[PDB]
Amino acid sequence: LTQETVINIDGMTCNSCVQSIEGVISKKPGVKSIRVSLANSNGTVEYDPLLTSPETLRGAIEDMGFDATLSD
Numbered sequence: 851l852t853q854e855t856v857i858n859i860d861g862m863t864c865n866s867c868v869q870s871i872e873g874v875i876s877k878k879p880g881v882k883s884i885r886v887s888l889a890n891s892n893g894t895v896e897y898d899p900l901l902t903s904p905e906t907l908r909g910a911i912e913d914m915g916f917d918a919t920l921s922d
């Protein structure tokens with residue numbers, strides 16, 4: 851079964867962030883549906899636990915260069 855994580859992504863300056871983030875993350879193994887937002891400053895990612903995790907996703911966002919932290 852799949853899970854979904856809301857990662858708060860702060861330091862998003864404009865929609866280039868949205869585009870780049872969703873572009874990169876959509877290609878990660880296990881990822882399915884994705885909804886990244888400038889306005890809400892976050893990334894709502896549906897994923898497969900066995901192939902990726904909230905920490906992996908958060909990690910990648912942090913590597914790109916944003917303040918990536920889980921909603922909980």
Ligand SMILES: [Ag+]
Nearest residue numbers: 863864866867
């Ligand atoms: Ag931007």
